Paper text:
One of the key proteins in long-term synaptic plasticity and memory is the activity-regulated cytoskeleton-associated protein (Arc). Drosophila has two isoforms of Arc, dArc1 and dArc2, with low sequence similarity to mammalian Arc, but lacking a large N-terminal domain. Both dArc isoforms are related to the Ty3/gypsy retrotransposon capsid, consisting of N- and C-terminal lobes. As opposed to the corresponding mammalian Arc lobe domains, which are monomeric, the dArc lobes were all oligomeric in solution, indicating a strong propensity for homophilic interactions.
In our 1.90-Å crystal structure, dArc2-NL is a domain-swapped dimer, in which the second and third helix of the canonical lobe domain join to form an extended helix. One layer of the dimer is formed by α2 of each subunit, which pack at a cross angle of 140.7°. The other layer is formed by the remaining helices, and α1 lies in a groove formed between α2 and α3. The subunit interface of the dimer spans 3440 Å2 of buried surface area. The interface consists exclusively of π-π and van der Waals interactions, and the helices encapsulate a hydrophobic core between the monomers, formed by Phe51, Val55, Pro74, Phe77, Ile80, Trp84, Trp95, Leu99, Leu102, and Phe106. The solvent-exposed surface of the dimer is charged and polarized; the electrostatic surface potential of the side formed by the two coiled α2 helices is highly positive, while the opposite surface formed by α1 and α3 is mainly negative. Only a part of the tail (residues 37–45) was included in the dArc2-NL crystallized here, reflecting the fact that our experiments were carried out before structural information for the capsids and the importance of the N-terminal tail was available. In our structure, this fragment could not be resolved, due to flexibility. The binding surface for the N-terminal segment is buried at the interface of the dArc2-NL domain-swapped dimer. Taken together, the structure of dArc2-NL reveals an intrinsic property of the Arc lobe domain to form alternate dimers via domain swapping, possibly regulated through interactions of the folded dArc2-NL core domain with the N-terminal tail.
Numbering used by the authors:
A (entry chain A), B (entry chain A): 9 to 73
């Protein structure tokens, strides 16, 4: 139940829900989740001041519009 | 159910299971999950050749010994 196990569950859930192949996943998912993680950390070191505002922020950054 | 939502669930599960405060979590968890993500990507661009070997790898890197 450590952080690494929860990280892997996220990646594997996403691979499953999106029906991504093992080959496309190996090629693509490490950089995608690396980008998410960097953006989250970047937006906390820049702006966010709260825990709820650190979560919400990452969403608004990957926004539908 | 996108990647960002699964990422947030991982972080929030970890915060909950470990009983981390909002203040310690804001300060600490973005860099921790950023590190995990970087290590995973690093170990795929270096060594791993398979999907099961990309998962397993990240574990062995955060190894108990």
């Amino acid at each position: 139940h450590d952080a690494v196990d929860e990280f892997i569950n996220a990646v594997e859930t996403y691979k499953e829900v999106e029906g991504i192949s093992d080959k496309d996943a190996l090629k693509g998912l490490p950089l995608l989740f690396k980008s998410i993680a960097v953006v989250w950390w970047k937006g906390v070191r820049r702006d966010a001041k709260t825990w709820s505002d650190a979560l919400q922020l990452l969403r608004d950054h990957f926004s539908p519009t």
